[PDB]
A paper describes a structure:
By contrast, in vertebrates the clustered protocadherins (Pcdhs) provide analogous cell-surface diversity, but in this case generated through stochastic alternative promoter choice. Biophysical measurements with domain-deleted proteins showed that Pcdhs also interact in cis, through a membrane-proximal dimer interface involving extracellular cadherin domain 6 (EC6) and potentially EC5. The specificity-determining cell-cell recognition interface of Pcdhs involves domains EC1–4, as shown experimentally through mutagenesis analysis and suggested by mutation correlation analysis.
Numbering used by the authors: 210 to 243, 247 to 539, 544 to 638
Write the structure that this text describes.
Amino acid sequence: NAPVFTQPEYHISVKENLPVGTRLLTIKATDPDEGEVTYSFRNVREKISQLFQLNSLTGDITVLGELDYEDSGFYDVDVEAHDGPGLRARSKVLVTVLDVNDNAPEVTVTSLTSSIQEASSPGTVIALFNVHDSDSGENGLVTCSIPDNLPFRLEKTYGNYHRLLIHRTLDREEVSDYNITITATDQGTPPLSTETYISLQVVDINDNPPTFTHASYSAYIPENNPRGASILSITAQDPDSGENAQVIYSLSEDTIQGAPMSSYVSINSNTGVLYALRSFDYEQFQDLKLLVTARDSGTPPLSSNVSLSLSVLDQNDNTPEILYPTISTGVELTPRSADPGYLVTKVVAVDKDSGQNAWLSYRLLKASEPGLFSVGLHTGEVRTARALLDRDALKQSLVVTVQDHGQPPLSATVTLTIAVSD
Ligand SMILES: *[C@@H]1O[C@H](CO)[C@@H](O[C@@H]2O[C@H](CO)[C@@H](O)[C@H](O)[C@H]2NC(C)=O)[C@H](O)[C@H]1NC(C)=O
Ligand SMILES: *[C@@H]1O[C@H](CO)[C@@H](O)[C@H](O)[C@H]1NC(C)=O
Ligand SMILES: *[C@H]1O[C@H](CO)[C@@H](O)[C@H](O)[C@@H]1O
Ligand SMILES: *[C@H]1O[C@H](CO)[C@@H](O)[C@H](O)[C@@H]1O
Ligand SMILES: *[C@H]1O[C@H](CO)[C@@H](O)[C@H](O)[C@@H]1O
Ligand SMILES: *[C@H]1O[C@H](CO)[C@@H](O)[C@H](O)[C@@H]1O
Ligand SMILES: *[C@H]1O[C@H](CO)[C@@H](O)[C@H](O)[C@@H]1O
Ligand SMILES: *[C@H]1O[C@H](CO)[C@@H](O)[C@H](O)[C@@H]1O
Ligand SMILES: [Ca+2]
Ligand SMILES: [Ca+2]
Ligand SMILES: [Ca+2]
Ligand SMILES: [Ca+2]
Ligand SMILES: [Ca+2]
Ligand SMILES: [Ca+2]
Ligand SMILES: [Ca+2]
Ligand SMILES: [Ca+2]
Ligand SMILES: [Ca+2]
């Protein structure tokens, strides 16, 4: 009779990743009469013909083309058998393909937002993306990941549609740009990830003013100073960017000695270098109060004020004046009967400067009769040091020198003519 298969249908359950040529199964037919047995496909299917290879003699079924679960999951194959002339025996072969997580998730970004205002309202849609995975089961479910520390809340809009919203108010002065990476994680083991990142640039509002490094300033200038002298350097900082962060310096206008402030001090608008336009004579005025403003470009401008206090330092640049005596007989008198210590005269002198530069000391330089008189060091009193004698001359002359105590010191000289009275 006809041959007999060991089973009218053969089953197998294999994974889709089975290498080509791997033996799938083996079909057996036997003749019961007492040989040569043919094994051939029955109704050849083009997909089944490409995907499965069997020879007649071995009767083994091996893989000819890679099986993709995503293409087809079940195969119904018709097989028969010949003994030569006799009736062809029929038998089915059923191949169950299993799913292997061999497709990482594919993320398609539908909408996006590439810029956001600093003081913007939270809740703006940053991105609306959808993820699709070709695999099946838990190998096909997908989760969307965003860095944890970054303060935003991501939620799923509907089904596999997700939204990326702003949970925390944004401020440009913290970080400039963003490289936000959403990583798609597969649930099937081992998991397969596919990450996609989006770029962003933060809009910058002019909401911060320029701030000075010190709440108040104070500089010092010598009395005489060159034209265009470098007095100070001022610097203010603006945490913004672009036009909204440039600094421009100005000197608020006041009046000194009836003259505008622009007469003595200028500032460079770009570099806070304070320049002195004239020399500040200490005996004319000692100090001036200034106000420095710093603004930014763009609209509207945003500025700040700082209180500068400029002080001129005195310099010994004035010789003492001897107001007494001047060129009334220039001759002072002294009695012949004058006791020791008689106040003959007293030198009067002043000094335009201040402090040690206005500290006068008078000393005796030259005397017609040496031990007769005495000049008070700090009072300038010309007095008698001894009693007068008949030998002493009728007309006397002293040379007094007035010194200031500055650095370096300056002196003056005066000759006193003192007549001896009788
Ligand atoms: C965002 O950052 C990632 C890094 O986390 C960047 O990825 C780099 O890409 C270059 C170019 O192909 C690779 O050579 C590096 O290996 C990647 N860095 C890694 C893996 O850490 C990505 O290009 C950035 N994109 C934007 C828009 O900023
Ligand atoms: C600067 O002037 C503004 C108003 O013009 C004022 O609000 C501010 O207090 C002033 N600066 C200082 C340090 O007082
Ligand atoms: C010019 O130079 C002086 C030093 O001589 C600085 O102190 C000033 O700030 C400016 O830079
Ligand atoms: C601001 O910039 C000036 C330059 O003009 C410096 O001299 C100052 O010390 C501050 O850094
Ligand atoms: C008065 O005295 C001072 C200091 O002794 C001198 O520097 C000056 O020239 C004048 O003679
Ligand atoms: C006082 O005396 C001195 C002498 O050294 C002169 O140099 C000066 O001009 C003043 O007459
Ligand atoms: C007064 O006269 C004397 C001369 O003894 C000078 O030395 C002095 O400088 C001042 O002219
Ligand atoms: C007496 O004479 C002297 C010059 O010898 C003067 O310096 C003095 O002021 C007074 O006239
Ligand atoms: Ca596959
Ligand atoms: Ca698969
Ligand atoms: Ca997958
Ligand atoms: Ca801000
Ligand atoms: Ca800003
Ligand atoms: Ca600003
Ligand atoms: Ca002077
Ligand atoms: Ca002076
Ligand atoms: Ca002086």
